[PDB]
Amino acid sequence: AAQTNAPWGLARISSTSPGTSTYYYDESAGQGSCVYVIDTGIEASHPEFEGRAQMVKTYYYSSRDGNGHGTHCAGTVGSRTYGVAKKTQLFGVKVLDDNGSGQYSTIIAGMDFVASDKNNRNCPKGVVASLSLGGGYSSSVNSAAARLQSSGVMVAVAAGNNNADARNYSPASEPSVCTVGASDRYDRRSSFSNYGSVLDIFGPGTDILSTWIGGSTRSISGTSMATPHVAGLAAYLMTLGKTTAASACRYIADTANKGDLSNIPFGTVNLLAYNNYQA
C-alpha cells in the first residue's frame, strides 16, 4: 500500500532517505495488534480512528481527552491518515489530566493496568504500549515500565524534551523498554530531544500532524510524537510476524536507517525507525 502526500514522519519511516512524501506500507497495517496509548486519553469518536479506538481506563473524573495530546499520539500510532499502523486496535489509558500532567503514582498504576488488561483482549499479533510522558528520574516509574515490558507488551517511551541526557528522566531511563528520541524532517535530532546511551531509536518528532480533540488535527512537536511512530511500527512489524513484543525494539534498531541523523552526540545511537517495506 501507498499513502500519497502522507505526513512527513510516515513517509520517513518507509524511506531510506528524507524528503519523500509517500508512506509505503504492507496492507496488513497492524491488523490484529493492539496498542495502549497511556496519556491524556483518546477521543475515540474521532473519524480518523474508524471505530478502532476505545478508552479502557481513566484515573480522572472522565475518560475524555480534554487536552489533545493523547489523541494526537494515538493518531500517530493508528489513525487512518496519520497513523503508522492504520488497522491496529487502540486502547486509551488516561493517566494524565487535561493539562497534560500526571502524578507518578497514577502513571505507574496505568502501566500495571495495561499489563493486566491485555490478558482480557484479543490481540493475536501482540500488544504494544506507547508512553509519551515522563518526568525526572524515578526508579519506581522505571520499574513499572520494566514490568509492563516483561509482561509481554512492547513498551515505547519518550526520551524527553529537555535537550539533555535521558538518564535523568523516567521512564526514558528504563533500559528494558524502547526509549525514543525525536528527529526532524531534515534528519536532524530535534532541538529539544533528549539523547544519551539509553536511547534505542529515533522517530519523527518535529512538526508531526495528527488527530486532535474536537475531531480536529494539528501539528505539534516532541519526543511524545516520535514515540507513537515507534509504537505503531512495532505493531505493524508484529502483525507481519517479523518480530515479537519482547524483541521488537531490538528488531527496529537492527533494521533502522543507520547514520542518517545529524546533531547526534557521540554515544547516542544514530538509528531512525524504518519499516523496510518492499512492494
Site of interaction with Ca ion (CB under 5 A): 16, 200, 257, 260
**Smallest separation, CB 200 to Ca ion (Å):** 4
Considering the complex, state which of residue 113 and residue 274 has its C-beta at the smaller distance from Ca ion: 274
Catalytic annotation, pick one of 33, 138, 224, 229: 224
What backbone torsions phi and psi does residue 216 show, to the nearest 5 degrees? -110, -170
CA-nearest of 270, 129, 278 to 196 is 270
Q: Which three cell numbers stand for residue 266?
A: 557521540
Does the annotation count 69 as an active-site position?
A: yes
Q: Which of 229, 232, 190, 195 is nearest to 207 (CA)?
A: 190
Q: Is 39 a catalytic residue?
A: yes
Residue 202, beta-bridge partner list: 181, 272
Is the CB of residue 238 less than 8 Å from the CB of residue 154?
yes
Strands 135-136, 169-170: pairing kind: antiparallel
Q: Are 90 and 54 in contact (CB under 8 A)?
A: yes
Known binding residue 84? Answer is no
Helix axis angle, 139-150 to 104-117, nearest 10°: 10
Which of 14, 15, 65, 69 is an active site residue? 69
- Among the listed residues 39, 65, 98, 187, the single catalytic one is 39
Tell me the HSE value of 189 on the side-chain side, using a 13 A CA sphere.
26
Number of neighbours of residue 119 by Cβ within 10 angstroms: 10
Give least dist CB 157 to Ca ion, A.
9
- Report whether the peptide linkage leading into residue 47 is cis, meaning its omega lies within 30 degrees of zero: no
Minimal distance in Å, beta carbon 258 to Ca ion? 8
Q: Measured from the CB of residue 198, what is the shortest distance to Ca ion in angstroms?
A: 6
Q: Which residues are catalytic?
A: 39, 69, 224
User: What residues are designated binding site?
Assistant: 16, 175, 177, 200, 260
User: What residues are designated binding site for Ca(2+)?
Assistant: 16, 175, 177, 200, 260
